[PDB]
Design an enzyme around this catalytic site. Sequence first.
Site, PDB file in Angstrom:
ATOM      1  N   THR A   1       0.853  -1.185   0.000  1.00 25.17           N
ATOM      2  CA  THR A   1       0.000   0.000   0.000  1.00 25.17           C
ATOM      3  C   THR A   1       0.896   1.245   0.000  1.00 25.17           C
ATOM      4  O   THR A   1       2.120   1.148   0.172  1.00 25.17           O
ATOM      5  CB  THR A   1      -0.910   0.002   1.240  1.00 25.17           C
ATOM      6  N   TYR A   2       0.282   2.410  -0.199  1.00 26.20           N
ATOM      7  CA  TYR A   2       0.997   3.686  -0.259  1.00 26.20           C
ATOM      8  C   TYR A   2       1.944   3.821   0.926  1.00 26.20           C
ATOM      9  O   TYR A   2       1.551   3.623   2.072  1.00 26.20           O
ATOM     10  CB  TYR A   2      -0.015   4.840  -0.297  1.00 26.20           C
ATOM     11  N   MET A   3       3.195   4.174   0.626  1.00 27.04           N
ATOM     12  CA  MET A   3       4.242   4.260   1.637  1.00 27.04           C
ATOM     13  C   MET A   3       4.437   5.528   2.460  1.00 27.04           C
ATOM     14  O   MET A   3       5.364   5.580   3.270  1.00 27.04           O
ATOM     15  CB  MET A   3       5.589   3.864   1.010  1.00 27.04           C
TER      16      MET A   3
END
Lengths: 245, 243
Positions: free
Chosen positions: B103-105
């Site tokens: 997922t988005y970091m």
Amino acid sequence: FVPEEFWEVDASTTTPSGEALALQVTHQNDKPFRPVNKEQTQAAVSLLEKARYSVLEREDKPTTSKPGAPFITSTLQQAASTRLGFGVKKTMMMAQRLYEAGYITYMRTDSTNLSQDAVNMVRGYISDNFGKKYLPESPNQYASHEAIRPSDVNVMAESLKDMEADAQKLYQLIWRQFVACQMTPAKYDSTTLTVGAGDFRLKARGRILRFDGWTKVMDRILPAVNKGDALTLVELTPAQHFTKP
Amino acid sequence: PEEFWEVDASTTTPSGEALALQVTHQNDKPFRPVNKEQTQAAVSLLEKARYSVLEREDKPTTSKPGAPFITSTLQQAASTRLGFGVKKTMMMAQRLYEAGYITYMRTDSTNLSQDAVNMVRGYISDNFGKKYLPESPNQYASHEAIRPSDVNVMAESLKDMEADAQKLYQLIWRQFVACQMTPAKYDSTTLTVGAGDFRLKARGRILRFDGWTKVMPDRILPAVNKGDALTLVELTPAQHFTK
């Protein structure tokens, strides 16, 4: 490996107007000129010394040179060797340190691809620092993970206070290759002179820069001479060479 | 940097078993020499003291898993466990995200979606067992946490990623699966020893149930009771500096 011996012969001449013109002997009897020993060269030299030199052809034409693709592991190694004198293993140790510090992208790659973010970043840099004529209408594409390039184009080599001189030189090489790959072509006005002397053919090549293009971020002027002009020989200089591995 | 010393004591129990001790107090005050002279002074005293077990405390203990990663905790764990710098970690995390593996970091939230919770609890039930699954999902103090997009995708399967990228994905994957597992259980032990004006200690624990440590992997103190006499074998001073 066994080195192969071969010789080259250059001739210094003067045009009808008195200007200097350097020539390289290219053919002898319509066959590529490439003597392999001193006696053979001397034989050729004795002939060139008495021959009558005249301009057979003069070709003037515009030419362009496009920038190279951004680096991949193999091309970075080749460039670091040729331009900076770094061996392969040293280049890779330094590249790994630049990557681990976050200054460049992953150094083991065989792809010349550039992400949209990287293209947006460098085109912005070019528009701001070089000008519209240095920016192609569309991004430059190359034959081919991502290429080895700086993580931030705004970061200059001299600002890497935590890296020794050679590492900064390697970063600069990577940085210049990346910025140049997205710039416009360099333009020249080239000239090629063909001279005849007995059973020998000689040549001189020159070019004049008209637009620097990519070379802004990252041979001579041949004198005036027309077809049929007579050249006066000044000096012949043979040179012995050996091929390398 | 501040210079400070420590002193370790190797001893033997009545049965003849080795017992390693650390000097913690001297004259009821924390032991912490700052130079060679101070340490040597303490060593000479410890060399002539009689050693005896003042107290033995045995009790069960629990270890709960940590929250799923957020940007700051991923950076810290990647540094501590894998030796990656912040910049490198973020470059790799960005590539894993761009490839759709995580997922988005960039996040400050430990929240997990209902779908992510369902997915990992199903994985745990299938691969580890009911005692590894809490009655209700584990909640953490706190967008969504950094986690794998598909728990069935293992690091080994990311052919398009170099070894260090696989290690980073593995770290994220293990942290995510572990955060939804049950506590680890141990039987801990603390030995307190008296030696002249000094107090020494030894700590041990035995794993009784691995729990979350099963997916995300000390000592066993010898048998000795309060009052047992110990035989000093060797004293080992150590010079340290703050970093």
